[PDB]
Amino acid sequence: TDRDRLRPPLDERSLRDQLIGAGSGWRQLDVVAQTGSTNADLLARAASGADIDGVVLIAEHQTAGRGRHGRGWAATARAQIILSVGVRVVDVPVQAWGWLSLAAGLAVLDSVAPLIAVPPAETGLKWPNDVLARGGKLAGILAEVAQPFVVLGVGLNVTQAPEEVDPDATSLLDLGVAAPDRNRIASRLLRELEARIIQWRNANPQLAADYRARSLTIGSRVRVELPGGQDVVGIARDIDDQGRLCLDVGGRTVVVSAGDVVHL
Numbered sequence: 001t002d003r004d005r006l007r008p009p010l011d012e013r014s015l016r017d018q019l020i021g022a023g024s025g026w027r028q029l030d031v032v033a034q035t036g037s038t039n040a041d042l043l044a045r046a047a048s049g050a051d052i053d054g055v056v057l058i059a060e061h062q063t064a065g066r067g068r069h070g071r072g073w074a075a076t077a078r079a080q081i082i083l084s085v086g087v088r089v090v091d092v093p094v095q096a097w098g099w100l101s102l103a104a105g106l107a108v109l110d111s112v113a114p115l116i117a118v119p120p121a122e123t124g125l126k127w128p129n130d131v132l133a134r135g136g137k138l139a140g141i142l143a144e145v146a147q148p149f150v151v152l153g154v155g156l157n158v159t160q161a162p163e164e165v166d167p168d169a170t171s172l173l174d175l176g177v178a179a180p181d182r183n184r185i186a187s188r189l190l191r192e193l194e195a196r197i198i199q200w201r202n203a204n205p206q207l208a209a210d211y212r213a214r215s216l217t218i219g220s221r222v223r224v225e226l227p228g229g230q231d232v233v234g235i236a237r238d239i240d241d242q243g244r245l246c247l248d249v250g251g252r253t254v255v256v257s258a259g260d261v262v263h264l
């Protein structure tokens, strides 16, 4: 109830002013009061012929949010930055598309990391789509294909209470950021995202280096839950050129393209 006072609406006109124009790759930005899923919405635009490259859709509230492989994403009004962007990908070899999602996580982390007074333990990226802080999930990322595009979706907990959405969640507010400004954070996020997408498109080695530098997974003992329910336990060693997680399982290398990681 008290957090409602900490949740003013986004300023669409201001965001457009900052993010659309010379020197920016963003072509269109809309803030909607509510939708089922920003990712579904941009996918639908693309399916009906729209050019969604550089298009940004932000929702104040999202009622049927999607997580990875069939799961959901929970939100309440004005508690998160909930957005999707369109990225033309057909010019880039399909092998490299995995890195687009890792790039997005890096952009989200970099957009908020300074806001914390002192970095609590376990602040960084958990493979393949998670921004963690103090062991809690601060943001989740979802990439979906609609040729010639990928739709990249970000759900970032700004004032969202864990009790409102998930026991393993956290938020900037719950990390001690007393009055987070979503307008400032959204602008920072989209500027970081633009740079990382450009790096991805040009196979810039700094993208992988920067990802490794913020990885909480690399070097850690992990249990990885694979699609289909199997678990593999090992030590995460690296990410390969396809964005896949390279596991050491007692001297054998197991490369995982998709799965859920638990740090042990």
Ligand SMILES: Nc1ncnc2c1ncn2[C@@H]1O[C@H](CNS(=O)(=O)NC(=O)CCCC[C@@H]2SC[C@@H]3NC(=O)N[C@@H]32)[C@@H](O)[C@H]1F
Pocket (backbone or CB within 6 Å): 036, 037, 038, 039, 040, 062, 064, 065, 066, 067, 068, 069, 071, 072, 073, 074, 075, 082, 083, 084, 129, 137, 138, 139, 140, 141, 142, 153, 154, 155, 156, 157, 160, 165, 166, 168, 169, 170
């Ligand atoms: N708030 C929330 N904060 C933190 N955690 C949470 C939370 N709402 C649930 N869990 C938990 O996360 C689980 C899903 N996690 S996941 O499989 O790794 N998927 C993701 O993290 C990707 C989420 C992408 C969300 C964005 S929001 C804008 C865009 N449009 C969409 O519909 N999706 C993307 C879910 O089953 C629930 F367990």
